[PDB]
Design a protein around this ligand. Structure first.
Ligand SMILES: Cc1cc(C)nc(/C(N)=N/c2nc(-c3ccccn3)cc3ccccc23)n1
Ligand SMILES: Cc1cc(C)nc(/C(N)=N/c2nc(-c3ccccn3)cc3ccccc23)n1
Ligand SMILES: Cc1cc(C)nc(/C(N)=N/c2nc(-c3ccccn3)cc3ccccc23)n1
Ligand SMILES: Cc1cc(C)nc(/C(N)=N/c2nc(-c3ccccn3)cc3ccccc23)n1
Ligand SMILES: Cc1cc(C)nc(/C(N)=N/c2nc(-c3ccccn3)cc3ccccc23)n1
Ligand SMILES: Cc1cc(C)nc(/C(N)=N/c2nc(-c3ccccn3)cc3ccccc23)n1
Ligand SMILES: Cc1cc(C)nc(/C(N)=N/c2nc(-c3ccccn3)cc3ccccc23)n1
Ligand SMILES: Cc1cc(C)nc(/C(N)=N/c2nc(-c3ccccn3)cc3ccccc23)n1
Ligand SMILES: Cc1cc(C)nc(/C(N)=N/c2nc(-c3ccccn3)cc3ccccc23)n1
Ligand SMILES: Cc1cc(C)nc(/C(N)=N/c2nc(-c3ccccn3)cc3ccccc23)n1
Ligand SMILES: Cc1cc(C)nc(/C(N)=N/c2nc(-c3ccccn3)cc3ccccc23)n1
Ligand SMILES: Cc1cc(C)nc(/C(N)=N/c2nc(-c3ccccn3)cc3ccccc23)n1
Ligand SMILES: Cc1cc(C)nc(/C(N)=N/c2nc(-c3ccccn3)cc3ccccc23)n1
Ligand SMILES: Cc1cc(C)nc(/C(N)=N/c2nc(-c3ccccn3)cc3ccccc23)n1
Lengths: 205, 205, 205, 205, 205
C-alpha cells in the first residue's frame, strides 16, 4: 500500500483544494436513481417517503494519474469528505434527507468519481387516487442548488429508473418510474437551469 | 483553476477572520422569502409548519477583488462556513429550523454575498378558521438575534412574498403573503431594533 | 475592523483560557425569563412544553478593556463557544433542551456579558385541572449543575417573569408567572445551593 | 485564577493522553443512581422511559497534584471531554441515551473525578401488571462495554438507590429500587465480568 | 502505562494512515449477530425495528507488535475513530442506524481488531402473519457498500445468530435466526459480491 498512500498524498495533501467548477471549467454530473421502497404516504400533509440510491458520476482532471507511475493502481476508495462533491438537491423535500449509507467514493485513474449515497427523502406529493387501479403520479426535481448549467451540466445514462431492487412486499407497487433531464431558460437571464425530474406512478398493492 | 485557488487563498487564508459588523462599520442585509409549502397545521398546539427559501444578500469590503488581477473571475461559490453570515432568526419558532439545502454561498467581486437556505420552520399560529372561505392569517418576525439596527440594517427588495414556487397541490392555498420591515425603539436605549414581518393569509384548498 | 480584530486577538488568542469561577473568585449570574408560549401539555406523561428566552448576565475581569486603547469600541459580539458560559440547567427536564437561537453573546468593555438563548423545554408537570377556571400551577428550578453558591451566585432583576411577548392565541393563558431565587443549605456541608424557581399558573383559553 | 490555569495547562496540555486502564493498572468506577421520573411506558413495544442521574466516581494518578504547588487549589471543574471517562453502558437500551445535563466533571487533588450526567433512557421492560397494586418489576444492567473486571472494577457506594428527588406527581410511583454489583466468571476465561443491576418495582399512582 | 502510551504512539502517531484494503492486499471481515429484541413492527409501512450487536473482526499487519518490546502488552482498547473500520451496511434499512454503545475497539498484538457496536435498525419487512402460530420471516443483507469481494471478504464463524441475550419478555419470540454468507457473480464482471444474510422467523408471544 506504499503506492496507494503516495498516490493519495500526491492528489490530496501535495495539491491545492479543488474550488469547484466554473463557467470556464464546467463539469457534467451523471445521475441515476435506484428506487428501493415507497415507505410511507401521508394524505393529510401531502408528503411521500422514498428510499432510494442516487448514483452520481463526474470527472476531474485534477484526480487523474498514470497507473504505471503508482504500481498499476487503477482506482481507489476514499471518504466523500476528502474530495469535492456536487450539491445535488431534491427541490421539493419537506425534511432533511437521511443518509443510509457510508459516505465513501470510488476514484478511477481517468479522474472519474462514483458516489452512490442511499437516502430517505420526504417530498411533496398528493397521493389522492393511490388506492385506485390507475394509481397516482408524482415528481421530484433534483439539481444543483447553487450552480447553473454554465457550471454544472446534468445528464442521465438512461431515462428508466432502476427498479431491479424495489422491495417486493412494499405497500406500494411502481407502475412506472422515469428520470429525465430538463433544461430551462428564463427571459431575464442568460444562464440555463438544469434538473433531473424523477417521475413515479404508483399505487397500493 | 489556478486563479480561483489564488483568489480564495488570498481572501480566506492570507487574511484575518472578519469579526462581524459594528456601529462604526455597519451592514445591510436584504431578505426575501419564497414560500414553497404550508405542510402542516396543528390545531391542538397552534403550530404551523412552513417550507420556504430565505434569500439573504449583503456586502463586505473585505470580500472585494479586482477581476483583472484574477483572470477575470467575477464570482465564486464557497461553503457558508468559510464566510461570516448574519444571525437572522425567526422570533416565534417552536422547534429548531431544519435546513433542506446545501449551505453554499455566492460571492461576487464587488463584495456582495448571496445565500439562499431552504428551511422548514415550525412557528406559533392559531389555524382556527383555516377551513372557511376567508381563511386565517398568521405572522412571524425575522431579525438578528444579537445585532441592533446600528450594526445590521435589514430591508426587503419588495413587500410581496414570492409565491411562484408554491406547491400547486398543497393542502393549503395562499390568499396573501407579505414581508415588511419594521423599526422599533426601547425607552432604555438609543439603538433601533429592526425585523421583517412575514404575514401569510391562507386556507384549505 | 482592525481594532476589533486586535481586541479579540488580545482577549482570546494572546490570553490563557478562563478556567471558570472558584470559591476565591466567585461570580454572580443574573437570570430572567421571557415566556413566549406554553406549546403543549401531555396529561398522559405529565410533561409540559414551554418556549421561552432566558436572559443571562455576568461580569469577568479578564474580559475588560479600555475603549481608548481600541478605537473607542465599547462592546462586541462573539460566538458563545469562544467564551466561558455558565452551566445553568433546568433541574426537571424530560428531554434535551432545544435551542431556538444563535449561540452568540455580547461582551462589553466593563467585562459584562449578555447571552439570551431561546429554548424549548419539556419538564415535569401534572396538568390536571388545566381545563378548569382556577387552572393549574407548576414549577421548574434552574441552577448550575456543578457549581455551588460559593462559586456561582444566582439572582434575578425582578420576580415577575416577562409576559409581554406571550403568544396571544396560545391554547393556554398565563394566569401568573414568577421567578424566585432560593437558597438551600444542607447539614453535611457549608456551601449553599442556589436556584431560580420559575413558577407558572395557567389554564386553557 | 493564574494557578488554576497553570494547573489545568500542566495536567492536560503539558501531559500525554491517558490511554485508559489495563490489567497492570486497573481502575475502580463507583456507580450510584438517582431516579427522577418514570416518564412513559409503552405496553405495545415493551419499552419504559426513565429520567435519572448516574453518579460516576473514579481515581487516576495522572490527575493528582499537590495543592501547595498550585495556590492551595483542592479541586476544579472541567469539561468531561477534556478527561478520560469510563464506557459505562446500559445493556438493554432501545434508543440512544439522551443527555439532560452539562457534560462537566469535578476533579480533586487526589486524582478523583466525579461526573453526574442526567439522562433519559429507553430500555426493555414489560409493563404488564403496572396498573395493579403489586405493580411491576424491571431491571437494567450497566457495565463497561469493552473492559473486563481485570481493567475496570465496578461497585456501588451508598446503601440505596436515591429516591429523594423522585417526581412527586409522576404517573408512576416507585415501590422499590435497588442497585447491586454482580460478578460473572466463565469456564473458558480467567477474567471476571462485572455489572451493576438497577432493579425498579413501580406502579400507576 | 508508559509502555501502552508508547505502543499507541508508535502504532497511530508514528505510522501512516492505513488507506483501506485493495485487490493486492485484501481483508477478511468476520461478522456475527447477537439479537437483543424485535422492538417494533409497523404493518402499515412494512418496517421492523431490531436491537442487536454486530460483532466485527479483522486483522491488519500494520497493527502488529511484539509484546516483548512493549512490557508484555498483548492487547488494548482504543476509540474506533483512531483506526480504519469496514463499511458494513444493512442493504434494506429505512432509517439511519442508531448506535447504542461506545465506539471502542480491542486491538490484539497479532493485528486483530474486535469491534462490537450495538445498534437499532429499521428495515423493510412485511409482518403479515406475525400474529399466527407459524409466524413470519424476514431478512436483511449486510455487506460492504463500496468494496467488492476482491477487497473485503465476509464470513461468519457460525450460521446461528446468538439468541442467548434475547429479551425474555419481548412482544415477539424468535422461532429461528440465522446468518449466512452469500456470494454473487455477475456475467459482466470478474469480481464477486458478498453479503451476510440475517434471516429471522418470529411471532407474537
Ligand atoms: C425550486 C427551486 C430550486 C432552485 C435551485 N431554484 C429555484 C428558483 N426559483 N430559483 C430562482 N428564482 C428566481 C426568480 C424567481 C421568481 C421571480 C424572479 N426570480 C431567480 C433566480 C436567480 C438566480 C438563481 C435562481 C433563481 N427554485
Ligand atoms: C447570483 C445568484 C446565484 C444563485 C445561486 N442564485 C441567485 C438567486 N437570485 N437565486 C434565487 N433567487 C430567488 C429569487 C430572486 C428574486 C425574487 C424572488 N426569488 C429565488 C431562489 C430560490 C431558490 C434558489 C435560488 C433563488 N443569484
Ligand atoms: C423576540 C425578540 C427579539 C429581539 C432581537 N429582541 C427582543 C426584545 N424584547 N428586546 C428587548 N426587550 C426589552 C423589553 C421587553 C419587555 C419588557 C421590557 N423590556 C427591552 C430591550 C431593551 C434593549 C434592547 C432590546 C430589548 N425580543
Ligand atoms: C431577544 C432579545 C435579544 C436582545 C439582543 N436583547 C433582549 C433584551 N431583553 N434586552 C434587554 N432587556 C432588558 C429587559 C428585559 C425585560 C425586563 C427588563 N429589562 C433590559 C436591557 C437593558 C440593556 C440592554 C438590553 C436589555 N432580548
Ligand atoms: C425548480 C426550479 C429550479 C431552478 C434552478 N429554478 C427554478 C425557477 N423557477 N427559476 C426561475 N424562475 C423564475 C420565475 C418563475 C415563475 C415566474 C416568474 N419567474 C425566474 C427566474 C429568473 C432567473 C433565474 C431563475 C428563475 N425552478
Ligand atoms: C435535581 C438536582 C440538581 C442538582 C444540581 N443537584 C442535585 C442533588 N441532589 N445534589 C446533591 N445531592 C446529594 C444527596 C442527595 C440525596 C442523598 C444524599 N445526598 C448530595 C450532594 C452533595 C454535593 C453536591 C450536590 C449534592 N439535584
Ligand atoms: C466534591 C463535590 C463536588 C460536586 C459538584 N458535587 C459533589 C457531589 N457529591 N455531588 C452530588 N452527589 C450526589 C449524591 C451523592 C451521594 C449519594 C447520592 N447522591 C448527587 C448529586 C446530584 C446532582 C449534582 C451533584 C450530586 N461533590
Ligand atoms: C449485554 C452484553 C454486554 C457486554 C459488555 N458483553 C456481552 C457479551 N455477551 N459478551 C460476550 N459474550 C460471549 C458469548 C456470548 C454467547 C455465546 C458465546 N460467547 C463471549 C464473550 C467473550 C469475550 C467478551 C465478551 C463476550 N453482553
Ligand atoms: C478480547 C475481547 C475483548 C472484548 C471487549 N470482547 C471480546 C469478545 N469476544 N466479545 C464478545 N463476544 C461475543 C460473542 C463471541 C462468540 C459468540 C457469540 N458472541 C459477544 C459479545 C457481545 C457483547 C460484547 C462483547 C462480545 N474479546
Ligand atoms: C433540586 C436540588 C438541587 C440541589 C443542588 N440539591 C438538591 C438536594 N436534594 N440536595 C441534597 N439532598 C440531600 C438529602 C436529601 C434527602 C435525604 C437526605 N439527604 C443531601 C444533600 C447533601 C449535600 C448537598 C445536597 C444534598 N436538590
Ligand atoms: C442494495 C445494494 C447494495 C450494494 C453494495 N450494491 C447494490 C447494487 N445494486 N450494486 C450494483 N448494481 C449494479 C447494477 C444494478 C442494476 C442494473 C445494472 N447494474 C451495478 C453495480 C456495479 C458495481 C458495483 C455495484 C453495482 N445494491
Ligand atoms: C467501480 C465501482 C465501485 C462501486 C462501489 N460501485 C460501482 C457501481 N457501478 N455501482 C453501481 N452501479 C449501478 C449501475 C451501473 C450501470 C448501470 C446501471 N446501474 C447501480 C448501482 C446501484 C447501487 C449501488 C451501486 C451501483 N462501481
Ligand atoms: C449481560 C451480560 C453482560 C456481560 C458483561 N457479559 C455477558 C455474557 N453473557 N458474557 C458471556 N456470555 C457467554 C455465554 C452466554 C450465554 C450462553 C453461552 N455463553 C460466554 C462468554 C464467554 C466469555 C466472556 C463472556 C461471555 N452478559
Ligand atoms: C443487493 C445487492 C448487493 C450488491 C453488492 N450488488 C447487487 C447487484 N445487483 N449488483 C449488480 N447487479 C446487476 C444487475 C442487477 C439486475 C439486473 C441487471 N444487472 C449488475 C451488476 C454488475 C456489476 C456489479 C454488480 C451488479 N445487489
Amino acid at each position: 500500500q506504499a503506492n496507494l498512500m503516495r498516490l493519495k498524498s500526491d492528489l490530496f495533501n501535495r495539491s491545492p483544494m479543488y474550488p469547484g467548477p466554473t463557467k470556464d471549467d464546467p463539469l457534467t454530473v451523471t445521475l441515476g436513481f435506484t428506487l428501493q421502497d415507497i415507505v410511507k404516504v401521508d394524505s393529510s400533509t401531502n408528503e411521500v417517503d422514498l428510499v432510494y440510491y442516487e448514483q452520481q458520476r463526474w470527472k476531474l482532471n485534477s484526480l487523474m494519474w498514470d497507473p504505471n507511475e503508482y504500481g498499476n493502481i487503477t482506482d481507489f476508495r476514499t471518504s466523500a469528505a476528502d474530495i469535492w462533491t456536487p450539491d445535488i438537491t431534491a427541490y421539493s423535500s419537506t425534511r432533511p434527507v437521511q443518509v443510509l449509507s457510508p459516505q465513501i467514493a470510488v476514484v478511477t485513474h481517468d479522474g472519474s468519481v462514483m458516489f452512490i449515497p442511499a437516502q430517505r427523502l420526504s417530498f411533496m406529493c398528493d397521493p389522492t387516487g393511490v388506492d385506485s387501479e390507475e394509481g397516482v403520479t408524482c415528481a421530484v426535481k433534483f439539481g444543483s442548488w447553487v450552480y447553473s448549467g454554465f457550471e454544472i451540466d446534468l445528464k442521465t445514462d438512461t431515462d428508466q429508473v432502476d427498479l431491479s431492487s424495489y422491495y417486493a412486499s412494499s405497500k406500494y407497487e411502481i407502475l412506472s418510474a422515469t428520470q429525465t433531464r430538463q433544461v430551462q431558460h428564463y427571459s431575464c437571464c442568460p444562464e440555463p437551469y438544469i434538473d433531473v425530474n424523477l417521475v413515479v406512478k404508483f399505487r397500493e398493492r
